[PDB]
Every structure is written in structure tokens, then in C-alpha cells.
Structure 1
């Protein structure tokens, strides 16, 4: 397993728990309705240690870039400004966010050709499945 295996355009095909996760983050109604309705593509690109993740839906486009292992300021889709670190560890990309004394982790892994995204904050979870598309 390598980080390069995560590269490409991926399309959301299933979501569980996301609304509960957004509620744990304290996201307000407008953004929760967007999160519930949007069916994003995620575009992952990497060159060595540089990683970029872009998302595109009918509602919103987002993007961040980082160096694997380096702490950086991430402005999230819900508007937090987190201290984030991304690492490819034990066959997953792990995105660890810290802000205001809180923490949340997002993992991304290839399983049976699909991109499995899992979110957690304070034992509130979600699982989002994406299929590789052209």
C-alpha cells in the first residue's frame, strides 16, 4: 500500500453518519444541509511528500495542499481553522486536525478498489465510500 494508490478522481457513492459527525462539530443548519445534499468528487494528487485534496460538487469546491508530516493551517469545508497533519501510515492516509482543544481524525484507504473515508470526533463516526471515476 502506497499513498500514490489513492490518487485520482473519486465520486461519493455512499455516506453513513455524516450528519451526526457535522452535528458533533457544531456545524449550523446551512452547512449541514449542504453536507447532507452534496455528492462530491474528491481529487487526490501527490508527488512524493506533497499532497493536494480538492473536492467538487454542484454546491461547493474546496482544496488544500500540504507536505506529508508537516503541521499546517487547514481551513475546513465548515470553516474551522485547524492545525492539521497528514501522514500515510499503516496503509492509510491519516489527517489529524486539532483546534480549540478538540481533535478529529479523517482516514482514507483503498479497499476492494474503492476509497473508504472514515471520520471521527469524540466517538462520533462516519463512513463515506467513493468509487474511482474518469
Structure 2
């Protein structure tokens, strides 16, 4: 696999465990209902070693730019300010977040032309499936 196979615009088609994952991140019931309603686009750009992931929704647009392997300051959709590191390892893009003694791991890989986003926090797992637009 390659990091450049994840590149492009992707559109959400399936979601499993998003509510529980948001509950675990400390998200309020009101924001959880909104977040569950949204059907975002995920725009991935990869300059071989530089990475940008934009999440477009009519509700909220989020984005981060990093250099693979380097720890940067990331502001999340739910307003957490995290120290994040992104790494492309074993045919998957791994994003590890750290804030106020807590940790989360977002893994993005390709599976039958579809972008599979596995979000994990403690015992909680979420699976978001995206389909390519461009």
C-alpha cells in the first residue's frame, strides 16, 4: 500500500459506533446529535511526507496539516486542543491524539476502494466508511 492511495475527496456512506466514540471523548448529547446528523466529506492531501486532512460539513469544517512523524498542535471538531502525531505504517495512516492525560487513535486504510476510518478511545471503537468522490 501507499499514502497517496488515500489522497482525494471522500464522502461518508456508513458509520458504526460514532455516538459511543463521541460520548467517550466527552462530547455533550446536543453536539453528539448534530455530529450524528452530518454526512461529511473527507479531503486528503499527501505531499509524500506532508499531510492535510480536511473534514467538510455544513455544520463544521475542521482541518489539520502536519509532517508525518512530527508532533503538532491540533484543534478538534469537538474543541479539544491535542498534541497529535501522524504516521504511515503497515499500509495504514495512523493518527494518535493526546490531551489532558487521555489518548485516542484514528486509523485510515483502503479496503475495496473504500476509505475505512477506525476511531478508538479506551474500550470504545468507531468505524466510518467513506467512498471516493474525486
Normalising by the smaller structure, the TM-score range is over 0.9
Q: Tell me how far apart the structure 1 counterparts of residues 96 and 69 of structure 2 sit (CA, whole Å).
A: 10
CA distance in 2, matches of 1:76, 1:62: 7
Residue 58 (structure 1) shift: 2.0
Quick one: distance in 2 between partners of 1:31 and 1:124? 18
Give secondary structure in 2 for the equivalent of 1:98.
Answer: strand
Deviation string 1:50-78 (CA, Å, 9 cap, x unpaired) is 10001112211111100000001110111
What SS is found at the alignment partner of 1:117? strand
Pairwise CA distance, 1:44: 0.1
Cα separation, 2, equivalents of 1:29 and 1:19? 9
Give the equivalent residue in structure 1 for 2:7.
Answer: 7
Give the TM-score of the pair, scaled to structure 2. 0.97
2: CA distance between counterparts of 1:59 and 1:121?
Answer: 24
User: How far does residue 97 in structure 1 lie from its aligned partner after superposition?
Assistant: 0.4
Distance 1:77 1:60 in 2: 7
Number of corresponding residues: 134
Deviation at 1:8, TM superposition (A): 0.3
User: What does 1:64-75 align with in structure 2 at a 5 Å threshold?
Assistant: 64-75=64-75
The Cα of 1:26 is off from its aligned counterpart by 0.8
1:96 Cα deviation after fit: 0.2
Query: What CA RMSD, in Å, does the superposition of the two structures yield over aligned residues?
Result: 0.8
Return the TM-score normalized by structure 1.
Answer: 0.97
Deviations 1:93-120 (A, max 9, x none): 0000011111000000000000000000
Superposition deviation, residue 28 in structure 1: 1.1
- For structure 2, which runs of at least 5 residues remain unmatched after alignment? none
Which deviates further from its counterpart, 30-39 or 80-89?
Answer: 30-39
| SS of structure 2 residue aligned to 1:20 | helix
1:81-101 deviation per Cα after TM superposition (whole angstroms, max 9, x unaligned): 111000000000000001111
Task: Work out the CA distance in 2 between the residues paired with 1:20 and 1:77.
Answer: 16
